[PDB]
Design a protein around this ligand. Structure first.
Ligand SMILES: Nc1ccn([C@H]2C[C@H](O)[C@@H](COP(=O)(O)NP(=O)(O)OP(=O)(O)O)O2)c(=O)n1
Ligand SMILES: [Mn+2]
Ligand SMILES: [Mn+2]
Ligand code: NA
Ligand code: NA
Length: 326
DNA sequence: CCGACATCGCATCAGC
DNA sequence: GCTGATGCGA
DNA sequence: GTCGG
């Protein structure tokens, strides 16, 4: 649908979502507003009343009431007031820095630290992750053209197999869903000598190699199965590429497809699949799917030899990654 | 009137 | 020293 | 905030 049909309303709900998330520290209200904004974005009519939007799943009394005020007056006083509030705005803005959540943002603002310049004046008071998020603040909010994502994929696929021929690196996330641009790169790593039943430094060597060739530039978090960090394409003396976020995850190779499914997403989709499963007598996570039982006590896990397998167990139509936006 | 809305890895904090 | 809780994030 | 127990 043309976004201007109910663009005023979806914007309003999205702002409210971000504020509940970053300032009120209520993730479920953030999700509620998101859900209401999303479903309205699909509505192929121009909303005339709150009671009309009330019909859509995820729109209840409070939001329908807020829509009525917006249509009848062109704004939302609560949203107008929040926007002029120095404290709420600062807290909200600071959470745009990677590593800074609602708790840290609130405490920063409480001690007068409110801008990026304030943060730069106070490196002492930031932890390692936050410093990096601050350093590449602009870059991390840049979107990554798919062409560059392909360039980034080449490097990873190359260096991965260079360490050991039987690794299997799989770019998931928005990229796998075929998006024209991505927020970051998500790499899913698997190796034969690592199973659920089950060679140790399996993730570490790959990361080390990507640092070796100067592809990985910074580390946010690193462990046995999880990597969170920063990368950069090498420049062709023509100008330099932005620093990008990259997540790497080493997963039980015999659970490869539940992982590919989870880390391909989307965000709402993974959520809808798990919630559906429950209404239908199943429970999925990133590793297993397992039929809860009669009583709803999980039974044993199943074999899965392709993504479609999981789609079959609860039997939705196998939707291509491109289709899993919700 | 009121609880679910998923769960996890890693960094760091609170405390023994 | 350690375990467990919290924060932030995927 | 919304849905549904
Ligand atoms: N809260 C979250 C966060 C991430 N995820 C999963 C699904 C996402 O596809 C995946 C990766 O996170 P992600 O990189 O943040 N999003 P995703 O790659 O979809 O989109 P982008 O912003 O990168 O473009 O992990 C999730 O299921 N629930
Ligand atoms: Mn991503
Ligand atoms: Mn990611
Ligand atoms: Na409704
Ligand atoms: Na943040």
């Amino acid at each position: 649908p043309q976004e201007t049909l109910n663009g005023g309303i979806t914007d309003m709900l999205t702002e409210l979502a971000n504020f509940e998330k970053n300032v009120s520290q209520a993730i479920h209200k953030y999700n509620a507003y998101r859900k209401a904004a999303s479903v309205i974005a699909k509505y192929p009519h121009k909303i005339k009343s709150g009671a009309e939007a009330k019909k859509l799943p995820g729109v209840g009394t409070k939001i329908a009431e807020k829509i009525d005020e917006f249509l009848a007056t062109g704004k939302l006083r609560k949203l107008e007031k929040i926007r002029q509030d120095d404290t709420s705005s600062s807290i909200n803005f600071l959470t745009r820095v990677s590593g800074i959540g609602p708790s840290a943002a609130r405490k920063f603002v409480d001690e007068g630290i409110k801008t990026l310049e304030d943060l730069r004046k106070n490196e002492d008071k930031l932890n390692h992750h936050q410093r990096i998020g601050l350093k590449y603040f602009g870059d991390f909010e840049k979107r990554i053209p798919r062409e560059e994502m392909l360039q980034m994929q080449d490097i990873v696929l190359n260096e991965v197999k260079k360490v050991d021929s039987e690794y299997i690196a799989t770019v998931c996330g928005s990229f796998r869903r075929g998006a024209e641009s991505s927020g970051d790169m998500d790499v899913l790593l698997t190796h034969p000598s690592f199973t659920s039943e089950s060679q140790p430094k399996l993730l570490h060597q790959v990361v080390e190699q990507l640092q070796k060739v100067h592809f990985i530039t910074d580390t946010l978090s690193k462990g046995e199965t999880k990597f969170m960090g920063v990368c950069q394409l090498p420049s062709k003396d023509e100008k330099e590429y932005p620093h990008r976020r990259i997540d790497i995850r080493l997963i039980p190779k015999d659970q490869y497809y539940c992982g590919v499914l989870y880390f391909t997403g989307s965000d709402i989709f993974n959520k809808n699949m798990r919630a559906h499963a429950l209404e239908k007598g199943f429970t999925i996570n990133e590793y297993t799917i397992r039929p809860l039982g009669v009583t709803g006590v999980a039974g044993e896990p199943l074999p899965v030899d392709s993504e479609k397998d999981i789609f079959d167990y609860i039997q939705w139509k196998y939707r291509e990654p491109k289709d899993r936006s919700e």
